[PDB]
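User: I'm putting together notes for a lab meeting next week and I want to include a structural view of one of the chains we've been expressing. I don't have a solved structure, so I'd like a prediction I can at least talk through. The sequence is below, exactly as it appears in our construct file.
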Amino acid sequence: FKNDFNSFYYTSLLYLSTLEPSTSITLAERQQLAYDLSISALLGDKIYNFGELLHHPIMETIVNDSNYDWLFQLLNALTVGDFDKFDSLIKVQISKIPILAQHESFLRQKICLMTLIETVFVKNIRMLSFEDISKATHLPKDNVEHLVMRAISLGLLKGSIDQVNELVTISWVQPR
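Assistant: Thanks for the context. Below is the predicted structure for the 176-residue chain, given as structure tokens.
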């Protein structure tokens, strides 16, 4: 309460940083911390990388036990923008989990935000069209403007939508 998930995630990582190697945390508490970090990233105002989380040694505690394999594979599918893997898990894990069901549209938007931002970064594209973005997000061209506008609200990039032309121009973006 009176927090954001990116902030909770950061405090959660910082707690590992402040602890001595003789950690009070256990394997069981690490499984819960790995889970909580990941749910926080899945709902994160500021997580865009995800790749560091997906390989942080904290996660060894769940992947080696298949403890939260569904959550891990969901955050993996976001990390690579793999809509088919994401959709196959979303088709089950949203329905079974009330927090994720409340955030169903946040999950499906975060993959879309991230897929575009990665594309713009790695392919070094600086002008795009609503068509290409719609292929990369599965939103219709008539709605995709609002998704990419929200990325600028999140402060991830410096760009301008050119919706009258069905276009976008980016000029800076956070590294993937």
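A couple of points you could mention at the meeting. Residues 145 and 163 are 7 Å apart (CA to CA). The chain has one domain: 1-176.

User: Perfect, that's what I needed.
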